[PDB]
Structures are given as structure tokens and as C-alpha cells.
Amino acid sequence: TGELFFRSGFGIGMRKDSPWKQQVSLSILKSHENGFMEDLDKTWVRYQECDSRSNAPATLTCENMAGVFMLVAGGIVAGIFLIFIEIAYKRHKDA
Amino acid sequence: ANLAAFLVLDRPEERITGINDPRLRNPSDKFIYATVKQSSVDIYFRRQVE
Amino acid sequence: VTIHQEPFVYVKPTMSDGTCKEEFTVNGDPVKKVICTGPNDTVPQCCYGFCIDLLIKLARTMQFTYEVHLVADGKFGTQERVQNSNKKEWNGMMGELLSGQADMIVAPLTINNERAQYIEFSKPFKYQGLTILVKKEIPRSTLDSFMQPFQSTLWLLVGLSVHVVAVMLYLLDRLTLSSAMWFSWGVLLNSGSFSARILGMVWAGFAMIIVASYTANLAAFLVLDRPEERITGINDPRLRNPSDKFIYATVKQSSVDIYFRRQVELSTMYRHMEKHNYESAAEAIQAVRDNKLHAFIWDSAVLEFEASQKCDLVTTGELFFRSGFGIGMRKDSPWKQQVSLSILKSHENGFMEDLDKTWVRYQEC
Amino acid sequence: FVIVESVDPLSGTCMRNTVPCQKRYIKKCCKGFCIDILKKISKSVKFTYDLYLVTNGKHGKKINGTWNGMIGEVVMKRAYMAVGSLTINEERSEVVDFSVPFIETGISVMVSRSSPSAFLACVWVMMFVMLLIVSAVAVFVFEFTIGKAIWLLWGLVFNNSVNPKGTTSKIMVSVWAFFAVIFLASYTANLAAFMIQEEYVDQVSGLSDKKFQRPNDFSPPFRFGTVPNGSTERNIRNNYAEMHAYMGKFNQRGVDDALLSLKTGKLDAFIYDAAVLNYMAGRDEGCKLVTIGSGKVFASTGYGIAIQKDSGWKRQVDLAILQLFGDGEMEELEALWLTGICHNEKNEVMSSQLDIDNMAGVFYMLGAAMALSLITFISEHL
Amino acid sequence: VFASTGYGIAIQKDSGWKRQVDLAILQLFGDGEMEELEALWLTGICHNE
Amino acid sequence: LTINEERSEVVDFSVPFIETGISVMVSRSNSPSAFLACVWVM
Amino acid sequence: WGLVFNNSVPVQNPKGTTSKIMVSVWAFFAVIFLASYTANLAAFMIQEE
């Protein structure tokens, strides 16, 4: 989709006050300080499953064009057949 | 020029404009755009004006 | 009365003595002209305009003796606070109408929620527009192509390289070796040992992709960024970002200028417009010719006429403060309602597009 | 993030919604849309809010055995609540009360780019196939001459530019004539391909890079850094030692002044707050520099203002934030500040230029293949 | 432009709100929220203008 | 409904809420050879 | 003039040695002229109305 909608984030559920509350927040802080974040990207996020295009980088184009090129190959085999029939046509035509 | 057609081409847009996105902003049965029942952001819809 | 505006009117001094140059149209008609006294910057002068024309056909509906006046001051009109007595006072054409110095005002000014309690007017003599005067930046893009934008060093580098490849050919030989000027370089221009023949295919595809590279160069010659014109919208950031970098404003004491003068978000903007204001819309076209400011603002359709005036200028984005033009109406007029009707009939008839023939429809650039 | 000016000399007063402050103590215009966000905050908060100037040191940070700075000014308790946007800093966080995010931020160093030959697979499959049909026609020559004919039709492989007498074999070549014709169409086609839709990069690898993780290991110095007492740079003190090491040559002064150094480009990039970064993107002279990478997350965080540890509004203040994102008018806060100017957050614009050695890479790729043919030629001698 | 005009609603000939109603319009274009009226209606969907 | 001089002459018509005009719009389903001056001078 | 379209004239190139490169003038010239053809091909290929 386009862009940010209702900026927000995630965290740990906290009811009233917690014995682990503030120090837990600190733990989050240290998490931002350390690379365990990008490490978590390694756990999931950083994995690149699929590509991201805008235009169509088809510059290969090959298997798509295989009908036109291999079609030319059909012109070649047609060269064998029609060249053999016509070969008898002019060859035996001189005969 | 034909090659240019093969490359350059419209392939029209994806819609999905914004919070003001017209398709979303135009009540009809044509398109279906929503979220799941009983969600937090769903609540972000549940308290709204526009 | 009004102020000479090439979009609105063509007003110049008289020819010799009470004389107005007689000329047919680009379509060949010798459209009518009139005359009004006034200062040039209090003397008899000449009056011609497609607006003024609308006055002509206007009386051609309801017969009245056509009298033409000028505008003392430059502005259109505005409710204005004096230095004493504390009374807001419409000015100029507005004021002159409160002064009633003429029958009915004629000019391409917008109906103003301001002007509401001041004066009334009929439906728009035309649907008009107002926006920021946009100045066209100079595109270039010109090139000598494979000369200019191709491999400045590598243009020759790959070439002498091909001479070396020719040395490899003559190596395959060991004249025929001396023939490489034709063989390898001739391969390059395509101008006309089975082992070395492969190298034939080598310099071959080499030049193939080389010519291809020249094609890509053509794509550069055509496709290119030529970055944007800015001029976003009512929210346009450049306009929305106070600084001394760019200059964007309108003239002092204008109607749309008042559309800035009563605002919330525009505060800093109109603030800038104070120090940045100008006088004449002609002076705006001039400052544009000078590229004096970074930007200007005035009646938008008028600015389309300015697009006819010079190519150094650009068309702004879209509608800003939709409005139009009409005839000045004070309180009630004997010609009031039927005059509005005359406008209606004007919309019914083609005299509008005819007025485009008078000015608008002309395609200058 | 924050604006300021002089009060209006005509009236000697503030404008807009601006609430000014004294300077020692002389009133001077204090501005900016984030501070404004604090204003709209105090609105529903209904908390008397009176601005002050900062004494010294930009943000707060540890000084010697203590801290001296904005956060430190808070530690001085000379103020009820902070103003100005400084990143949430665990250290500073541990110091005293820090608010919830007004906006996100991160570590970044952004710069400009003043191409990988991809014009140069199964196309080759069609090539060898064309060699097979070439053999077929060579057989069709029955009723060098046959052998090098592969090179004859192969002449078309680049624009002909090298013929057998076969009458039917002629049109047999014509197969390769239309075929290779549209193959030229394929060449110019890929020419359109790369000719459109480019990307490239300045290839920012993040905190660590060739130019960073082993910066001294390369020939030129690539300078990416910040000014004295960089908060995110204080994180870089944790991030890498070689960082603060090379920071010496990286020494630079001023924020916008650093942007000026970017106009000079005497350094690789400028480490700064990703928020402040994007800021540096929007406000600019023209389109030159680009984000640290794409603006990919580096040290996800945010800046903002707060109050003393365990203050009155604290919880409810966070609630005020909850409203702030609540109405969605923060979008309108962009409209006040963060709104895009330079835009271009996605498109790659145009790389248009002449050919370069990068283009010459393929040229070399053939030129050495010539030498390969020389080795195989010695094999022919064998 | 072909036959420049507009549509809308009105009241009886010589009605009460008449002048002041026009003034209400003056407000309507006044605030600029008519842009937001596009946002309510006239806003572009197909775009491509 | 459009301001109509007839209808206008009938009774009170308001001021424009928005502009309008006469139009007939359509599509292009499926160019002028311009590929085919001083080039010839060269 | 064979070059004027992609060379492709079977007939008898001249034997002039200096005249050869003299033709080469038209070879690079007409080469970039092919570049001009594909160039206009880009022109109409882009920016239609």
C-alpha cells in the first residue's frame, strides 16, 4: 500500500504497574541500543522472499520471445521441407 | 518503436491513494475494501468522523 | 472604468488627434474600439478590449450612452481602514462606485465575500481563475549525441583498443595483416583462419552492443528527468516554507490579495507578500521577464493570456479560489436585473467564444 | 524539527501561533511546528506553558562526571518540562522521565550520486539453435563453404557486415534474415530496457560497510559522521570503535552547515538523526543528495520533549500524545512541517549521461575473450 | 469550455434569504473548504486529467 | 440544475455553486507518421 | 547512399584507399544517422498525444 496510516508500534502488555514495568521498558531501550532488532529481521523480517519491481525488467525476454525465434526455427524446418520439394521442382525441372 | 511499446507502456495504476483515497471514499458494491472484525486499527475506524 | 490589462483589454494612447488606428482582426474584422481619458504611468486616451467589447454588446442589448473612464489608482477596490475616524472604506473602483463616479463598473474582478456587504453583481460575465504566476525554466537537452554524450574517453579508447585487436588479427595471420584497417576497423564501421573468425564474432557483437549503446544514448537524449516545476498547491511546500530562497507573491492591494488578507494558515505567507508585494500586473509580467522574483501570483486566466505574452513563463497547477468577472453594481440598478439577463443571453450565444476570438482563442505559443 | 526567529521589529512581537522566549534575558522569537505540537498538546492538557531558551549544548548528554545540556538542564530541574526533540537515549532515559514518541527517528548518513552492463541467457540458446539450423542448411547445400557458412549467417548475429549461391538456401538464409532482424529488434529492445527503468545505488551498507566496517582498508577516505556529542553517535561509541576513531577526520560542525558540506561533498555522508535526515531531504537546494540507503531503518528510535522524572502530567501527557496521533492531524503536522518538498522518496529520476568505464566493462569482457581465442588458437596449433 | 455555466439550487423569485443566500455562497468559497467538497464529491478518482 | 436564461427569467436563480458547461465525452479505442527537414539538407 | 538505409547495396565498393576512409566519413556519419533514426523512434516512441 501507499504510505503510513496511523503510526504505531508494538510492546509488552502492562497492567497498572508491574514489578518488571520500568526496567522492562529499559530492556526495550537496550534492545534499540543493540542489534538484536536487525537480528530479529534475520529471524524473519530481513528475509527477502520475492522481488519488488515498478517497470518490467524483461530485458532477458527470451522464453517469451521463444515463439518468435523458435518460430523462425519453424521457418528453418520449413526451409528443409520446402527446399526439398522446390529442390525437386527446379532440379527435375531442369530434367 | 514496437520495442518501445514492449517496454514503455501504461499498465495503469494501483489505486490505493491515501486516507482520502477516493475508491475507498466512494460507497458502492463495485470494490470491497475493509479489515477484520474486532481489531485495534479497526477501532481506529470505530472512533471517527469522516 | 478599469485598468488596462492585455488579457482584459488593449489600451494605448490615441493615434494622432482623437485618432485610433483602424485594423481588421487576425480573422479580419475590424473590431470596434473606444476611448477614455486618464493618467498614463490625467489625459484623454483610447479604450479597446474584449471586456470593453462585452460593454459594447452589453449596451447593444440595453441602449445606453457608452462612456469610458479610467482608474485613478491602480487597484480594483478594497475595504480599507483610514488613519482617522475608524471607518473601513472600499477603495478605487469599489470606492469610485461608492463615489458613483461612473454609471456601472466594468472589470474582470471577482465577487468577494468582502465585496458582499460592499456591493453586488450578477452571475459571472465569465468563469475566471486566479493562481500563482509560474515562470518557465530554460530547457536545453541539446547534444552532439555520439559525439557529445558517448564515452568521452572510451569513444577513442575502445577504438584504439580495436586497433590492438586488429594486431591480434595480424598475429593470427603470421598486406593481409595490413588489411586490418579494412577488416577490423571496417568491421567496426560495418562499412564494407577459422580460429580468428571467432574473434570476428567478438569484435562483431562488440560493435553490435556498441551501436546499441549509441541507441541507449538516444534514449538519454529523449527520456530525461528535467526536474519538476514545483508549484504544488494551496499547500505547496515551497510557498509554505518561509525563507529568503524563493520569492512568490502578488501585487499590493488586490482582490485575491485580499483573499490572502483574510486567512488563517496563510498567515506567514501574506506576511511575506507584504515585503514582496508589487504594483502593476504589467509590472508582474515585467518582473517575470526579469525573472525578478522566484514566483508571482495574479488572476490565473489572465496568466494564460500571459502565456500568450511570453514563453519564459509557465502555467500553474490548478484552480485556486474559483471566481469570475462581471459588471459593477451599486445597490440596485435600473439596468441591474435585465443586465444580468444580458449576461445570461451572452452565455446562450456564442459571443463568448467570439470574445475568445477577440483575444483568448489566439494561440500565441 | 524546531524553528525560531526575531520578534517582529515593527511591533517587537511574535507572529503566527509562535510563542517566543528570552535570551540572556532578551525575548526572541521561538517557533516550529513540533513545539507547536507541544502547544496543541498543552491545549487539552491545560497546562501553563511558558517558553525558555536553551542555555548551552544543544541536547543533553553526560558532561564529565555529570551531564551538561538540554536533558542535563532537565537534570538541573531548572524547568518543569523539556522542549525540543532529542532522541530517546537509554542513558538519558535512565536519567529521568522521557516522553512517548512524538515521531520516529533513527541513525543515518545521507549523500548524493554524482549501470552494471546488464545489456551485456536463453538468447544464447537461440544462438546455438541457430547454429543447428545452420547445420541443417549446410546439409541443404548438397544438391569453409559449408563449414564457415555458420560464420556467414552468423554475420547477421551482428548487423551482417561480413555469400552462398544456393537458391533455396538463399531464402534459408532469409530465415536468419527476418529472425536476426527481429533479433536486432531484441538488441534495441533491451536498449530500451536499460534505457528505461534504472535504479543503481550509492550502496550504503549501514553502520558497517566496505567504506565503513573497513573504512581505512580502502584507498580514499569515505567520511560519514556528525558533530560533537552526537547522541546517535554516542550509540556509535557502542556500535564501533573504529567509528569514533575515524570520527576525528570526520569532524564536522553545524547541521545545516553539514548540509553545506554535502554541497561541497568533502565527506562521504553525514551521520545524523534519520528524522533529521528526512528533514535534510525535504529542505534542500535541489535534487542531489539522497537518503542514507533508501532510508532503511538504522537504530530505530525517536526524538521529542519530556519532563522531570516522575512528573505531574506524565501518564496523562502520554495520553495527550494518544490524542495527537488520535485525530490524525499529525498528517497536518507534516503539513505544518514534515510535508514533503523534494518528494522523490521513490523514483530514481534520471541517470542520463555519456558512456563510462562501467559501460566499458563489457568491452573488456570481449577483449579478453579474444585472448581466450588466442589460447584455444594455440590449442589448434596443438 | 462549451457553454460556460453552472448548476445548483435556488428559491422562489424574490425570496427571503436571496441576497444573504448568495452571501452564504460567498462564505462557501470563502473558507476554501469547497476543496474539501471535492474531497466529499468532486475529488478525482480516475485522475488522468 | 444549470442556470438557464429561460428558467432564469422564470424565477430566482442562485449564484454558482460550481461551474458547468455543455459536453459530450467518449473514448479512443485504437499516430500521424511524424517519423516520416534539414535532415534532408544534410 | 547505400548507407542512407543500413548500407545493404550489393554493388561494387570503390577501390580507393584514401577514398575508403572517405567513405568511412559516411560510415560514422551515417552510423550516428541510424542513431538519429532510432532516436526519433524514441521520440514518437515516447510523448504521444
CB burial readout A69-90, b (16+ within 10 A) else e: beebbebbeebbeebeeebeee
Cα gap D140→C71, rounded to integer Å:
94
How far G6 CA sits from the closest chain D CA (Å)? Answer: 9
Q: Yes or no: say if D131 and D301 are a contact pair by the CB < 8 Å rule.
A: no
Q: Which amino acid is at D85?
A: S
At residue D278, the 3 state secondary structure works out as helix
Q: Which amino acid is at C4?
A: H
B18/A3 touch (CB, cutoff 8 Å), yes or no: yes
Cα gap C89→C71, rounded to integer Å:
17
Query: Can chain B be said to touch chain D, i.e. do they have 3 or more Cβ pairs within 8 angstroms?
Result: yes
Residue E31: its H or E element: helix E18-31
| CA distance to C227, D154, D169, G32, per residue, from D174 (Å) | 47, 12, 8, 27
CB burial readout A5-39, b (16+ within 10 A) else e: eeeeeeeeeeeeeeeeeeeebeeebeebbeeebbe
Query: Can chain A be said to touch chain C, i.e. do they have 3 or more Cβ pairs within 8 angstroms?
Result: no
Task: Pick the residue from chain C with its C-alpha nearest to F13.
Answer: C123
Q: Yes or no: say if G16 and C198 are a contact pair by the CB < 8 Å rule.
A: no
From C41, C24, C43, select the one nearest C32 (Cα to Cα): C24
Q: Does C337 touch chain E (CB under 8 A)?
A: no
How far E20 CA sits from the closest chain F CA (Å)? Answer: 11
Beta bridge partner(s), residue D270: D110, D225
- Output the CA torsion D319→D322→D326→D331 (10° steps): 130
Q: Which amino acid is at A45?
A: V
Cα gap A20→A14, rounded to integer Å:
9
Q: Yes or no: say if C70 and C41 are a contact pair by the CB < 8 Å rule.
A: no
Q: Does C344 touch chain F (CB under 8 A)?
A: yes
Q: Which of D159, D161, D188 sits opposite G38 (nearest CB)?
A: D188
Q: Yes or no: say if D120 and D348 are a contact pair by the CB < 8 Å rule.
A: no
Cα gap D310→B49, rounded to integer Å:
35
**Helices (H), ranges, A10-61:** 21-33, 36-43
Q: Which amino acid is at A11?
A: G
At residue D319, the 3 state secondary structure works out as helix
- Output the CA torsion D130→D134→D136→D139 (10° steps): -170
Which subunits have 3 or more CB–CB pairs within 8 Å of chain C?
D, E, F, G
Q: Which amino acid is at E6?
A: G
In terms of Cβ atoms closer than 10 Å to its own Cβ (0-12, 13-18, 19+), residue D175 is: buried
From C121, C146, D171, select the one nearest A85 (Cα to Cα): D171
End-to-end CA distance of chain E: 15
D238/A59 touch (CB, cutoff 8 Å), yes or no: no
Which subunits have 3 or more CB–CB pairs within 8 Å of chain F?
C, E, G
Chain D hits for A22, Cβ within 8 Å: none
Cα gap D280→D338, rounded to integer Å:
11
Chain C hits for F15, Cβ within 8 Å: 111, 123
At residue D373, the 3 state secondary structure works out as helix
End-to-end CA distance of chain F: 61
Cα gap D28→D53, rounded to integer Å:
9
In terms of Cβ atoms closer than 10 Å to its own Cβ (0-12, 13-18, 19+), residue C112 is: buried
DSSP per position, D232-274:
HHHHHHHH-HHHHHHTTTT----SHHHHHHHHHT-SSEEEEEH
Chain G hits for F35, Cβ within 8 Å: 40-41, 43-44
Chain G hits for D188, Cβ within 8 Å: 38
The neighbour count for residue D245, using CB atoms within 10 Å, is 12
- D92 among annotated binding-site residues: yes
Q: Which residues contact residue F7 at a Cβ distance below 8 angstroms, ignoring those fewer than 6 apart?
A: F1, F13
C-alpha cell at C335: 439596468
Written in H, E and C, the secondary structure of chain B is: CHHHHHHCCCCCCCCCCCCCCHHHHCCCCCCCCCCCCCCHHHHHHHCCCC
How far F33 CA sits from the closest chain G CA (Å)? Answer: 9
Chain centroid to CA C22: 29
Cα gap D92→D301, rounded to integer Å:
13
How far A47 CA sits from the closest chain D CA (Å)? Answer: 14
Q: Yes or no: say if D362 and D117 are a contact pair by the CB < 8 Å rule.
A: yes
* Count of all residues that appear for chain B in the document: 50
Chain B hits for D195, Cβ within 8 Å: 7
Question: Taking every pair of C-alpha atoms in chain C, what is the biggest distance, in angstroms?
Answer: 110
- D209 among annotated binding-site residues: no
Q: Does G39 touch chain B (CB under 8 A)?
A: no
How far B29 CA sits from the closest chain D CA (Å)? Answer: 27
Query: Can chain F be said to touch chain G, i.e. do they have 3 or more Cβ pairs within 8 angstroms?
Result: yes
Binding-site residues from annotation of C for glycine:
108, 110, 115, 255, 299
C-alpha cell at A42: 534475520
Binding-site residues from annotation of F for L-glutamate:
2, 7
Chain G hits for B4, Cβ within 8 Å: 41-42, 45-46
Model resolution, angstroms? 5.0
Hey, what long-range contacts does G25-32 have (CB within 8 A, 24 or more apart)? Answer: G26/C191, G27/C189, G27/C190, G27/C191, G27/G3, G28/C146, G28/C189, G30/G3, G30/G4, G31/C146, G31/C189, G31/C190, G31/C211, G31/C214, G32/C145, G32/C146, G32/C147, G32/C214
Q: Which residues contact residue C130 at a Cβ distance below 8 angstroms, ignoring those fewer than 6 apart?
A: C110, C256, C259, C297, C298, C299, C300, C320, C321, C323
Cα gap B3→D195, rounded to integer Å:
12
From C95, F17, C233, A35, select the one nearest D208 (Cα to Cα): A35
How far A90 CA sits from the closest chain D CA (Å)? Answer: 10
Residue C252: phi, psi to the nearest 5?
-70, 140
Residue D112: its H or E element: strand D107-112
Chain D hits for C194, Cβ within 8 Å: 147-148, 151
* Count of all residues that appear for chain A in the document: 95
